[PDB]
Amino acid sequence: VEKFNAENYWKKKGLAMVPLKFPVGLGSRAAGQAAALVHIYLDGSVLVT
Amino acid sequence: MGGQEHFYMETQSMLVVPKGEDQEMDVYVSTQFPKYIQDIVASTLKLPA
């Protein structure tokens, strides 16, 4: 890229790298609770919600 | 001893609605046995319960 920019005046290339720390959390326990409901019918099939 | 008609004032009544996805079926029916309606409808359609 430095070689390209030394050889082109009206066109320029650029390059960059950034790191990532994305923390995950909601600030309270109650805000992270979850629930489900599962049925098994007598033919063996399952319904989940 | 002779027989007897039930003579429920509401005659046999049902509305069967397909959802349009995954061959899902919703059956609204005047019945005493929803589990049995589910079994015979699923069997007739070759579907899991």
From Swiss-Prot, chain A:
Signal peptide: none
Coiled coil: none
Cystine pairings recorded for this chain: none
Induction info: In liver, is down-regulated by adiponectin and by the PPARA agonist, fenofibric acid.
Tissue and organ expression note: Abundant in liver, expressed in adipose tissue and at lower levels in lung, skeletal muscle, pancreas. In contrast to mice, no significant gender difference in AOX1 expression level (at protein level).
Additional notes on this entry: AOX genes evolved from a xanthine oxidoreductase ancestral precursor via a series of gene duplication and suppression/deletion events. Different animal species contain a different complement of AOX genes encoding an equivalent number of AOX isoenzymes. In mammals, the two extremes are represented by certain rodents such as mice and rats, which are endowed with 4 AOX genes, and by humans, whose genome is characterized by a single active gene.
Entry similarity comment: Belongs to the xanthine dehydrogenase family.
Task of the protein: Oxidase with broad substrate specificity, oxidizing aromatic azaheterocycles, such as N1-methylnicotinamide, N-methylphthalazinium and phthalazine, as well as aldehydes, such as benzaldehyde, retinal, pyridoxal, and vanillin. Plays a key role in the metabolism of xenobiotics and drugs containing aromatic azaheterocyclic substituents. Participates in the bioactivation of prodrugs such as famciclovir, catalyzing the oxidation step from 6-deoxypenciclovir to penciclovir, which is a potent antiviral agent. Is probably involved in the regulation of reactive oxygen species homeostasis.
Assembly information from the UniProt record: Homodimer.
Protein name: Aldehyde oxidase
Parent-protein start and end of this portion: 993 to 1041 of 1338
